[PDB]
Amino acid sequence: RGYSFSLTTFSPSGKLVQIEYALAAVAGGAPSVGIKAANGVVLATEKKQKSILYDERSVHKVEPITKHIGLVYSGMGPDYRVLVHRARKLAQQYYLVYQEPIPTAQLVQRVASVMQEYTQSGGVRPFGVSLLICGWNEGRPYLFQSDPSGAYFAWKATAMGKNYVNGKTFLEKRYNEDLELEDAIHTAILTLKESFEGQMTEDNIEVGICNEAGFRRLTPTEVKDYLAA
Amino acid sequence: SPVTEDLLRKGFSCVKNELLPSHPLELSEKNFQLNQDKMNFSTLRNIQGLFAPLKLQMEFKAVQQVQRLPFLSSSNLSLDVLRGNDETIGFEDILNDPSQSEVMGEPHLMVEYKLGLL
Amino acid sequence: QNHWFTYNETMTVESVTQAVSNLALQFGEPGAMSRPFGVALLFG
Amino acid sequence: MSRGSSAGFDRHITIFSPEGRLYQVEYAFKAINQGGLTSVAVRGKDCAVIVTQKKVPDKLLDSSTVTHLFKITENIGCVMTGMTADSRSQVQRARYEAANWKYKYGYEIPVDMLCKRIADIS
Amino acid sequence: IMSYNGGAVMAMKGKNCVAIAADRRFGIQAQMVTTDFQKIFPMGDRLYIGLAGLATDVQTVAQRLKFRLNLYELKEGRQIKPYTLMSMVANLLYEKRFGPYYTEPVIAGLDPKTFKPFICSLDLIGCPMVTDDFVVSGTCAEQMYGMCESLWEPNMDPDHLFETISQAMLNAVDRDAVSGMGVIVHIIEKDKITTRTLKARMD
Amino acid sequence: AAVSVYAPPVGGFSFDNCRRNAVLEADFAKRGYKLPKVRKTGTTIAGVVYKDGIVLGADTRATEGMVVADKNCSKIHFISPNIYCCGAGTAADTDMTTQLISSNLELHSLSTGRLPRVVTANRMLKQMLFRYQGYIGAALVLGGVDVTGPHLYSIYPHGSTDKLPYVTMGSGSLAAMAVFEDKFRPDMEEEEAKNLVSEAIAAGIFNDLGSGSNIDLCVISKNKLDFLRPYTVPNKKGTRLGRYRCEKGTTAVLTEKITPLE
Amino acid sequence: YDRAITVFSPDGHLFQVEYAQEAVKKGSTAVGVRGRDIVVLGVEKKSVAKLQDERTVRKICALDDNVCMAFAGLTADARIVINRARVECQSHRLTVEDPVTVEYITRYIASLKQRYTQSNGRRPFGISALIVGFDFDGTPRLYQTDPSGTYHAWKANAIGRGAKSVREFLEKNYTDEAIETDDLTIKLVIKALLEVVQSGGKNIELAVMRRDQSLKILNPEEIEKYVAEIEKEK
Amino acid sequence: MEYLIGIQGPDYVLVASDRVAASNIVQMKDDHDKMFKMSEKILLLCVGEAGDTVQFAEYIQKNVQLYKMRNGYELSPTAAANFTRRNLADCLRSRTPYHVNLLLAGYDEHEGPALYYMDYLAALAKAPFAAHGYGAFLTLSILDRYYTPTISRERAVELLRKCLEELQKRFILNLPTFSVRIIDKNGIHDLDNISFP
Amino acid sequence: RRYDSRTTIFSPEGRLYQVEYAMEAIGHAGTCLGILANDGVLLAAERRNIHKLLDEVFFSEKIYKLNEDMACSVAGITSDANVLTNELRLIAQRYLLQYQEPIPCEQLVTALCDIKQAYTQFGGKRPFGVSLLYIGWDKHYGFQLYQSDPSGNYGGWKATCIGNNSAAAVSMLKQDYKEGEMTLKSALALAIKVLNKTMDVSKLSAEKVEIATLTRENGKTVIRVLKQKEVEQLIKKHEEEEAKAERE
């Protein structure tokens, strides 16, 4: 198709081939699950570092921002660190002025705009990545998901990533609101178990909660305790 | 020192005091990124060779021309990690942030000036 | 007219044909042109 | 640039595949084996020994200027593998970045920051 | 330089009530050209600002602050907390620290959620500070601390608050050539705003 | 929008006032009019290095000339979990020039996963202050414990730096630092260090005009961060003898408007 | 050999200009004729669209108290050109205290059009103008721009789709007698425009301009009255 | 130096002036209209430093016609004032040590007349009767003494005549004759010049 | 034809094919009403996202608020509307900073259409895919409504319908509009009837529509969004009226 191969041209039906291709690419990645509960939120994901040659420290997925915002990627590894650094810089830029921490929504809008800015231009590829971010403001929990083109949604139980349709179908019959983190973590673990190609181990889960204390990331032994329980 | 060899579009600026600098922190604030880049380029050209400044500056030129049109705010997500100011927040973004510009020009005029046609 | 103002004398036809041809020579790669001037003149 | 980007699903970096794979970077991964080398680095508990391989194409070439083990800082090394013409530039870039960091923060860099800076600028 | 014009503003924190008052006069040094010149701006609903100093910069800073406040209010959705405007004006003034403005703003209002009275102040170039009992700034700064320190009292009802803010200004601002001839009193209780105009010596 | 704009606006410190400011100042200097002033809060700051951690402290008076503008103004800021600074003179500038470095160090700490080191803060402050050659004055006392050991610094408003075991900067500082010179000994204890710094700051507050009211201390020991405010009240205001409150109807009224909100 | 402005053909025939002309020859028509002391600038409205309001959609734009404007083609480019012409007129009046002549402003518009034909990164402005107005010396003037770079001091020409028929009708009837009084010019222009349009009065707009009385559009009642008067042919 | 006054009323913004020129010790011309016209309902008086006044007035006058010609309708006096003040402030602080005084006028169709006083540092008041120049000192008290809150158009001319007679009798300079213009809801009316033999 | 690879080339017949193709993008968005009445200016909407795992957000997802009176509704690629609405807010606030009056409609619609068109003349950037519908009040022309276009062809429409199934909705609106005499309640009833006539006929609910009004009263223009329970009774009344068709 001649109308493809370039993101600046519309196909003669109304679409953008490159954007859909990038969406399929980020779909073809690593599964991730996010659950919103009346008390807090939980973000669960697994890593490809299965072999013992790798290390638990150093490289890490769920990088916190400030104290109330935490994210997780489900796309290309070397293609979200720059985005994360930009998000932290934007949070600090907002913090120097308006001497009070960033609310989630403004950060979502700004990161969505900066991500979209590499769509309308010509000659640079869109970011292949799609990331959830969780916040806790005004005594309320917030969950959002970002798309390669950039369109935030007020999602509640998204299981986007590899084989995300099965995760969505499984989650559409378990979540019922009015839950604490104790059951939410188990639900997320079950959702990951539904499609993992193997058994969960002590060094394959990177759950991180965002209760009304901050963005504590669960220690490996604590994850072992929950996995056993 | 130039002679004439539209005043409504650009007017009300006497020749008297642009060749008379203001408060001495004028040439060190109006042109800061350019001076820092020039100093770094000179240092690299002196100590490492002639390849590094040419390569780095032409990389700057290559990455500069993919932003949005001038009459809209530029994200500038790239060119920043390459410049080295990836996390060096300072008195350049919290004071008079260009996103909330108090005055704004015409789109066609600004883009045609950016192209240098005028 | 600029030459008259500068040197305070009249033009010589070669001295203006040279100038106009030099201007028209700029075809190629700044309000620079991009196509040859599809025109022709008979200076007299 | 007045030459354009070659049309094709795998002929340029900024074009995604129909399934969503960057074929140019995969070709880049395949390109390391073109030169032909092997490097092994093992860390124990108090040492960080690095071993590599050296091949002399002929006899006339000197044996002292063909090393593939450069030095970045006073106490950091590298075992660069692949095309020499690009490692010879990444080494200089890393040296400049290390010097800049030492000037801006006044202590020797942890390995993670140098690795991250190189990864980002790549 | 805050003598080319005139101005004086107070702020007292009572019991769920805040009061802000100013002086109406605009004149070129000795001469006087008008008697009505507002120096109190209705930013928000239960919030107010009290710019006082050189007028030609008062107008500009008020316009810019109103613009930025509208932008933030529209973008972020809900109203602005009183503490945020403090850093707002601090940033706006430090924007031109080297080319300084000439304003000594006073901010006084209520929290839209807690209804806890709040009062702050600012210097010429922006240096945030909060005083619990009261604050005052203006051209006639010296001849108000003495009047206010003794007359003040904690935990005051609105009526006594109005009486005190009237007595700390009406006979304390006439002891100066410039910045006289009229006093506006703004009392901001919990539910309804109320404005009053006193009468003073016409000299 | 506008019809006389070519280039996009550029942020940073604006300078479109000095041309008018100079001529206005020349006009108003010879006519004996009022002159602008800033909160030149000349305050005493003290710091000592005892056996385990560091102790800081400063007075809490903020003047703007010959009039006491404030009676309670914190002279101790927050930079990191285990680094504190102090300000002296032109508090408006020192607040921002400390907050900026605090945010930069927070970004660095978030990107590194480990606690920052004091030398980084010193380097950044030195670079910024020397970049703005003069025209911005904020004498600082930077102290904090790190992974190596206790540290202390004495940044000047031109870029100079030192590594003294004790330092006293500000308008009124000679009294406190002379008390230090007389009483200080190496390798003291915690409570003794607190008593010594309190005594020095008390001498400085009494024997000077630019300082007054309460004092505070900022013990930042290795595994315990403390922030005591206020620590001691040396002076207490008396009481008003006669009631001078005015009753209802005391003041007149000309016009009145009532508007109900919701 | 037609994929870039800068390139030519083996014979010549700069093709992007010709394609722009073809695009211009697709919009609503437009006419104009000068008299003793009068100018008319009638146009025709392609669709009624009673839900739409005729106030916003219009073609007869004002450029000055002595110069008016009527275009044909893509709307946005014409609006941009009119804005630039207004700004240039005001700037020239500021720099010289003299009301601008028609020729100067029409030359400026032609130059602005021609500037966007010198690099294969900017498409040309595809529109056609009918600049007409009164000079400072009182002599009636009329012009007509062209997408490429050209302009002619026409007398009673026309543009838009189906312009050959109306041009022939105008040239077969234009005489000094028909330009003597005021309403005779209106009768002539209405008779000219009545050809291409299906039914008159419904979607025909005029703009009568007199000596320094400024532009004055005509309400539908006057148009209906003029059509009724011109319907007395025998 | 010069002289500018303007008195308000129920439905008029009557303004006077001083048709005169300036030089070292010489009067170049005895009739120099200072009254630039903005629109059919707005005047703009301007006295200041030579050259800068006629330049700034010209620039600010070939900018209000643009708005009318680009939007069909016409500005309002309040918008005109809040625009002129902004332009004056931005331009004066930019690079030029200007010295210009202005006195706007105008009559809209919703709230009576409107007269605005502006100094040379770009302030903005709404006084009911202001003055400029040096004659302000000697004439503002006379204007304030007889100024009933409501003044008929007939009596406004008489009040102006008295206020100008006092200035012509007690002033150092030789302002020989004055111009008078009154604005109503019919355009820009004109009155016969005030000339003292 | 082959003359559509780049958005800078004409056609032998004469047409910009790229913008014509982009015109079809707004054909895959929810419908948008917005008929004009005598007093208020009603503005309906449509929420495509009707999934069971979406949390509510303030001010719906389509209706916005520009400065104090004017709203907008978007359609098409939503990833390019958050920039236009932000820049339009900025231009309105900038005009207010310049002149201290509420902005008229033209100095906003034309201002945004300028940028929207300018991205169609400097090839190297794809044009915005949007169909912004405007609304507002002023003191110069009363109440009026405008409808935009990706190329930029804004017209002072009195009642229109952008998005999918626009042809049938527009035609039936044209055939059933009481021009001249029009009330807010009757306008709302007509809007409900139009929405029921269009769409896949799912009988609608409070979880599929959004309604905004512009009632001006007490000299202070206000914008209000009807509550979730404020439309169920309206739908019930419309259903009762439809069922009360008698016949035989």
PDB file of N, CA, C and O in Angstrom, chain E residues 1 3 29 46 57 94 96-97 99 102 126 129 149-151 160 163 167 191 193-197, chain F residues 14 17 20-21 25 31 33-34 39 67 92-93 237 240 244-245 251 254-257 259 261-262:
ATOM      1  N   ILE E   1      10.584  55.143  46.361  1.00  0.00           N
ATOM      2  CA  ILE E   1       9.926  55.481  45.108  1.00  0.00           C
ATOM      3  C   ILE E   1       8.416  55.326  45.285  1.00  0.00           C
ATOM      4  O   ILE E   1       7.627  55.854  44.501  1.00  0.00           O
ATOM      5  N   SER E   3       6.351  56.947  46.662  1.00  0.00           N
ATOM      6  CA  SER E   3       5.804  58.233  47.057  1.00  0.00           C
ATOM      7  C   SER E   3       5.269  59.025  45.876  1.00  0.00           C
ATOM      8  O   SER E   3       4.607  60.046  46.092  1.00  0.00           O
ATOM      9  N   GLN E  29       2.312  63.364  42.901  1.00  0.00           N
ATOM     10  CA  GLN E  29       3.086  64.059  43.935  1.00  0.00           C
ATOM     11  C   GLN E  29       2.145  64.985  44.695  1.00  0.00           C
ATOM     12  O   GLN E  29       1.152  64.492  45.261  1.00  0.00           O
ATOM     13  N   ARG E  46     -14.410  34.251  47.698  1.00  0.00           N
ATOM     14  CA  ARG E  46     -14.072  34.560  49.082  1.00  0.00           C
ATOM     15  C   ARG E  46     -12.587  34.850  49.253  1.00  0.00           C
ATOM     16  O   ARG E  46     -12.012  34.567  50.310  1.00  0.00           O
ATOM     17  N   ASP E  57       2.413  50.229  37.910  1.00  0.00           N
ATOM     18  CA  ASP E  57       2.760  48.820  37.984  1.00  0.00           C
ATOM     19  C   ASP E  57       1.691  47.993  38.678  1.00  0.00           C
ATOM     20  O   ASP E  57       1.602  46.785  38.428  1.00  0.00           O
ATOM     21  N   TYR E  94       9.256  37.670  41.177  1.00  0.00           N
ATOM     22  CA  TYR E  94      10.647  37.300  40.955  1.00  0.00           C
ATOM     23  C   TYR E  94      10.964  37.163  39.472  1.00  0.00           C
ATOM     24  O   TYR E  94      12.142  37.155  39.101  1.00  0.00           O
ATOM     25  N   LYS E  96      10.839  39.438  37.364  1.00  0.00           N
ATOM     26  CA  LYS E  96      11.597  40.634  37.029  1.00  0.00           C
ATOM     27  C   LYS E  96      12.377  41.127  38.238  1.00  0.00           C
ATOM     28  O   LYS E  96      12.327  42.314  38.566  1.00  0.00           O
ATOM     29  N   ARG E  97      13.079  40.221  38.921  1.00  0.00           N
ATOM     30  CA  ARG E  97      13.798  40.609  40.130  1.00  0.00           C
ATOM     31  C   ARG E  97      14.831  41.689  39.842  1.00  0.00           C
ATOM     32  O   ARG E  97      14.994  42.627  40.630  1.00  0.00           O
ATOM     33  N   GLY E  99      14.904  43.827  37.155  1.00  0.00           N
ATOM     34  CA  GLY E  99      14.091  44.981  36.838  1.00  0.00           C
ATOM     35  C   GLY E  99      12.857  45.074  37.718  1.00  0.00           C
ATOM     36  O   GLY E  99      11.735  44.824  37.267  1.00  0.00           O
ATOM     37  N   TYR E 102       7.098  47.674  41.512  1.00  0.00           N
ATOM     38  CA  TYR E 102       6.895  48.450  42.736  1.00  0.00           C
ATOM     39  C   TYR E 102       5.504  48.124  43.279  1.00  0.00           C
ATOM     40  O   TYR E 102       4.536  48.854  43.055  1.00  0.00           O
ATOM     41  N   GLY E 126       9.439  39.688  46.324  1.00  0.00           N
ATOM     42  CA  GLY E 126       8.866  38.381  46.573  1.00  0.00           C
ATOM     43  C   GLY E 126       9.595  37.591  47.639  1.00  0.00           C
ATOM     44  O   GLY E 126      10.616  36.955  47.361  1.00  0.00           O
ATOM     45  N   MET E 129       5.850  35.334  53.547  1.00  0.00           N
ATOM     46  CA  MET E 129       5.797  35.317  55.000  1.00  0.00           C
ATOM     47  C   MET E 129       4.342  35.407  55.437  1.00  0.00           C
ATOM     48  O   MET E 129       3.534  36.077  54.791  1.00  0.00           O
ATOM     49  N   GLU E 149      -0.828  47.350  67.008  1.00  0.00           N
ATOM     50  CA  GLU E 149      -0.331  46.386  67.984  1.00  0.00           C
ATOM     51  C   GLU E 149      -1.139  46.423  69.274  1.00  0.00           C
ATOM     52  O   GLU E 149      -1.507  45.373  69.814  1.00  0.00           O
ATOM     53  N   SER E 150      -1.427  47.620  69.785  1.00  0.00           N
ATOM     54  CA  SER E 150      -2.164  47.719  71.039  1.00  0.00           C
ATOM     55  C   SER E 150      -3.639  47.393  70.847  1.00  0.00           C
ATOM     56  O   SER E 150      -4.239  46.693  71.670  1.00  0.00           O
ATOM     57  N   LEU E 151      -4.240  47.895  69.767  1.00  0.00           N
ATOM     58  CA  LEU E 151      -5.680  47.760  69.581  1.00  0.00           C
ATOM     59  C   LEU E 151      -6.100  46.342  69.222  1.00  0.00           C
ATOM     60  O   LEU E 151      -7.287  46.018  69.335  1.00  0.00           O
ATOM     61  N   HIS E 160     -16.666  43.656  66.260  1.00  0.00           N
ATOM     62  CA  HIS E 160     -15.451  44.208  66.845  1.00  0.00           C
ATOM     63  C   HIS E 160     -14.325  44.256  65.827  1.00  0.00           C
ATOM     64  O   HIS E 160     -13.502  45.175  65.856  1.00  0.00           O
ATOM     65  N   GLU E 163     -14.925  47.333  63.791  1.00  0.00           N
ATOM     66  CA  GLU E 163     -14.594  48.515  64.580  1.00  0.00           C
ATOM     67  C   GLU E 163     -13.087  48.711  64.674  1.00  0.00           C
ATOM     68  O   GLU E 163     -12.589  49.835  64.542  1.00  0.00           O
ATOM     69  N   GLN E 167     -10.896  51.810  63.254  1.00  0.00           N
ATOM     70  CA  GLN E 167     -10.155  52.696  64.142  1.00  0.00           C
ATOM     71  C   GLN E 167      -8.655  52.658  63.899  1.00  0.00           C
ATOM     72  O   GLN E 167      -7.971  53.640  64.198  1.00  0.00           O
ATOM     73  N   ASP E 191     -20.293  33.495  54.996  1.00  0.00           N
ATOM     74  CA  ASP E 191     -21.280  33.242  53.957  1.00  0.00           C
ATOM     75  C   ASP E 191     -21.482  34.380  52.966  1.00  0.00           C
ATOM     76  O   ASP E 191     -21.802  34.105  51.807  1.00  0.00           O
ATOM     77  N   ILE E 193     -20.160  38.363  51.414  1.00  0.00           N
ATOM     78  CA  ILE E 193     -19.239  39.489  51.338  1.00  0.00           C
ATOM     79  C   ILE E 193     -19.997  40.779  51.622  1.00  0.00           C
ATOM     80  O   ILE E 193     -21.178  40.920  51.286  1.00  0.00           O
ATOM     81  N   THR E 194     -19.321  41.731  52.263  1.00  0.00           N
ATOM     82  CA  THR E 194     -19.918  43.017  52.590  1.00  0.00           C
ATOM     83  C   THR E 194     -18.875  44.114  52.439  1.00  0.00           C
ATOM     84  O   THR E 194     -17.740  43.971  52.901  1.00  0.00           O
ATOM     85  N   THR E 195     -19.268  45.209  51.794  1.00  0.00           N
ATOM     86  CA  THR E 195     -18.388  46.340  51.545  1.00  0.00           C
ATOM     87  C   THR E 195     -18.954  47.587  52.208  1.00  0.00           C
ATOM     88  O   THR E 195     -20.164  47.828  52.167  1.00  0.00           O
ATOM     89  N   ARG E 196     -18.075  48.379  52.814  1.00  0.00           N
ATOM     90  CA  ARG E 196     -18.459  49.624  53.460  1.00  0.00           C
ATOM     91  C   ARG E 196     -17.480  50.721  53.071  1.00  0.00           C
ATOM     92  O   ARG E 196     -16.316  50.457  52.763  1.00  0.00           O
ATOM     93  N   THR E 197     -17.967  51.960  53.090  1.00  0.00           N
ATOM     94  CA  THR E 197     -17.158  53.134  52.781  1.00  0.00           C
ATOM     95  C   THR E 197     -17.228  54.090  53.964  1.00  0.00           C
ATOM     96  O   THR E 197     -18.303  54.605  54.288  1.00  0.00           O
TER      97      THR E 197
ATOM     98  N   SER F  14      13.599  38.601  33.075  1.00  0.00           N
ATOM     99  CA  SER F  14      13.303  39.728  32.207  1.00  0.00           C
ATOM    100  C   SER F  14      14.096  40.957  32.641  1.00  0.00           C
ATOM    101  O   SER F  14      14.548  41.069  33.784  1.00  0.00           O
ATOM    102  N   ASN F  17      12.761  46.820  32.582  1.00  0.00           N
ATOM    103  CA  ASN F  17      12.433  47.868  33.544  1.00  0.00           C
ATOM    104  C   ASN F  17      13.588  48.795  33.888  1.00  0.00           C
ATOM    105  O   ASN F  17      13.331  49.911  34.350  1.00  0.00           O
ATOM    106  N   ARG F  20      13.647  52.525  32.537  1.00  0.00           N
ATOM    107  CA  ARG F  20      12.761  53.439  33.251  1.00  0.00           C
ATOM    108  C   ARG F  20      13.199  53.613  34.699  1.00  0.00           C
ATOM    109  O   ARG F  20      13.094  54.711  35.262  1.00  0.00           O
ATOM    110  N   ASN F  21      13.685  52.534  35.318  1.00  0.00           N
ATOM    111  CA  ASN F  21      14.041  52.581  36.731  1.00  0.00           C
ATOM    112  C   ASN F  21      15.175  53.562  36.989  1.00  0.00           C
ATOM    113  O   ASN F  21      15.157  54.289  37.986  1.00  0.00           O
ATOM    114  N   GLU F  25      14.785  56.774  39.367  1.00  0.00           N
ATOM    115  CA  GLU F  25      15.622  56.907  40.553  1.00  0.00           C
ATOM    116  C   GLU F  25      16.386  58.222  40.542  1.00  0.00           C
ATOM    117  O   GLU F  25      16.531  58.873  41.582  1.00  0.00           O
ATOM    118  N   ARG F  31      14.995  64.838  45.017  1.00  0.00           N
ATOM    119  CA  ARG F  31      13.781  65.459  45.526  1.00  0.00           C
ATOM    120  C   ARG F  31      13.424  65.006  46.935  1.00  0.00           C
ATOM    121  O   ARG F  31      12.395  65.435  47.466  1.00  0.00           O
ATOM    122  N   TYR F  33      12.468  61.992  48.245  1.00  0.00           N
ATOM    123  CA  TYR F  33      11.276  61.165  48.334  1.00  0.00           C
ATOM    124  C   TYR F  33      11.626  59.810  48.944  1.00  0.00           C
ATOM    125  O   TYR F  33      12.783  59.515  49.254  1.00  0.00           O
ATOM    126  N   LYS F  34      10.605  58.976  49.122  1.00  0.00           N
ATOM    127  CA  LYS F  34      10.809  57.659  49.707  1.00  0.00           C
ATOM    128  C   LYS F  34      11.608  56.769  48.763  1.00  0.00           C
ATOM    129  O   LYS F  34      11.584  56.936  47.542  1.00  0.00           O
ATOM    130  N   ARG F  39      13.911  43.156  52.451  1.00  0.00           N
ATOM    131  CA  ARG F  39      14.049  42.530  53.765  1.00  0.00           C
ATOM    132  C   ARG F  39      15.478  42.017  53.930  1.00  0.00           C
ATOM    133  O   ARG F  39      15.769  40.825  53.803  1.00  0.00           O
ATOM    134  N   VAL F  67      12.503  48.923  60.971  1.00  0.00           N
ATOM    135  CA  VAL F  67      11.206  48.494  61.476  1.00  0.00           C
ATOM    136  C   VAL F  67      11.169  46.972  61.474  1.00  0.00           C
ATOM    137  O   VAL F  67      11.562  46.338  60.489  1.00  0.00           O
ATOM    138  N   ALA F  92      14.579  36.972  50.158  1.00  0.00           N
ATOM    139  CA  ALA F  92      13.872  36.690  48.915  1.00  0.00           C
ATOM    140  C   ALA F  92      14.738  35.885  47.958  1.00  0.00           C
ATOM    141  O   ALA F  92      14.275  34.909  47.359  1.00  0.00           O
ATOM    142  N   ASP F  93      16.006  36.273  47.809  1.00  0.00           N
ATOM    143  CA  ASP F  93      16.892  35.544  46.909  1.00  0.00           C
ATOM    144  C   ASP F  93      17.278  34.187  47.484  1.00  0.00           C
ATOM    145  O   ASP F  93      17.339  33.193  46.747  1.00  0.00           O
ATOM    146  N   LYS F 237       6.896  39.135  75.494  1.00  0.00           N
ATOM    147  CA  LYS F 237       6.193  40.408  75.545  1.00  0.00           C
ATOM    148  C   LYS F 237       5.391  40.517  76.834  1.00  0.00           C
ATOM    149  O   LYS F 237       4.854  39.526  77.335  1.00  0.00           O
ATOM    150  N   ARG F 240      -0.830  44.165  78.136  1.00  0.00           N
ATOM    151  CA  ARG F 240      -1.481  45.461  78.025  1.00  0.00           C
ATOM    152  C   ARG F 240      -2.279  45.741  79.291  1.00  0.00           C
ATOM    153  O   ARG F 240      -3.023  44.879  79.769  1.00  0.00           O
ATOM    154  N   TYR F 244      -8.465  49.177  75.489  1.00  0.00           N
ATOM    155  CA  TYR F 244      -8.705  50.271  74.555  1.00  0.00           C
ATOM    156  C   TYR F 244      -9.622  49.856  73.411  1.00  0.00           C
ATOM    157  O   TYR F 244      -9.651  50.522  72.372  1.00  0.00           O
ATOM    158  N   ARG F 245     -10.371  48.771  73.579  1.00  0.00           N
ATOM    159  CA  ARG F 245     -11.265  48.305  72.531  1.00  0.00           C
ATOM    160  C   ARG F 245     -12.410  49.291  72.319  1.00  0.00           C
ATOM    161  O   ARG F 245     -12.898  49.925  73.258  1.00  0.00           O
ATOM    162  N   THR F 251     -17.472  54.119  65.082  1.00  0.00           N
ATOM    163  CA  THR F 251     -17.068  54.691  63.806  1.00  0.00           C
ATOM    164  C   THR F 251     -18.291  55.029  62.966  1.00  0.00           C
ATOM    165  O   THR F 251     -19.319  54.351  63.046  1.00  0.00           O
ATOM    166  N   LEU F 254     -20.751  55.941  55.640  1.00  0.00           N
ATOM    167  CA  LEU F 254     -21.342  56.730  54.566  1.00  0.00           C
ATOM    168  C   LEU F 254     -22.211  55.900  53.634  1.00  0.00           C
ATOM    169  O   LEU F 254     -23.381  56.232  53.421  1.00  0.00           O
ATOM    170  N   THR F 255     -21.668  54.826  53.065  1.00  0.00           N
ATOM    171  CA  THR F 255     -22.419  53.927  52.200  1.00  0.00           C
ATOM    172  C   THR F 255     -22.121  52.488  52.596  1.00  0.00           C
ATOM    173  O   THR F 255     -21.096  52.193  53.215  1.00  0.00           O
ATOM    174  N   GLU F 256     -23.030  51.588  52.229  1.00  0.00           N
ATOM    175  CA  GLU F 256     -22.898  50.190  52.610  1.00  0.00           C
ATOM    176  C   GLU F 256     -23.599  49.308  51.586  1.00  0.00           C
ATOM    177  O   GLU F 256     -24.722  49.602  51.167  1.00  0.00           O
ATOM    178  N   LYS F 257     -22.928  48.227  51.191  1.00  0.00           N
ATOM    179  CA  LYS F 257     -23.475  47.247  50.264  1.00  0.00           C
ATOM    180  C   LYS F 257     -23.351  45.856  50.866  1.00  0.00           C
ATOM    181  O   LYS F 257     -22.327  45.521  51.467  1.00  0.00           O
ATOM    182  N   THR F 259     -23.862  41.777  49.769  1.00  0.00           N
ATOM    183  CA  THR F 259     -24.033  40.819  48.681  1.00  0.00           C
ATOM    184  C   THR F 259     -23.902  39.415  49.255  1.00  0.00           C
ATOM    185  O   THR F 259     -22.857  39.088  49.854  1.00  0.00           O
ATOM    186  N   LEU F 261     -23.225  35.429  49.184  1.00  0.00           N
ATOM    187  CA  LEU F 261     -22.619  34.367  48.400  1.00  0.00           C
ATOM    188  C   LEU F 261     -23.382  33.066  48.645  1.00  0.00           C
ATOM    189  O   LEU F 261     -24.475  33.060  49.217  1.00  0.00           O
ATOM    190  N   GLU F 262     -22.812  31.947  48.213  1.00  0.00           N
ATOM    191  CA  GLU F 262     -23.443  30.649  48.415  1.00  0.00           C
ATOM    192  C   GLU F 262     -22.538  29.715  49.211  1.00  0.00           C
ATOM    193  O   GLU F 262     -21.318  29.727  49.045  1.00  0.00           O
TER     194      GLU F 262
END
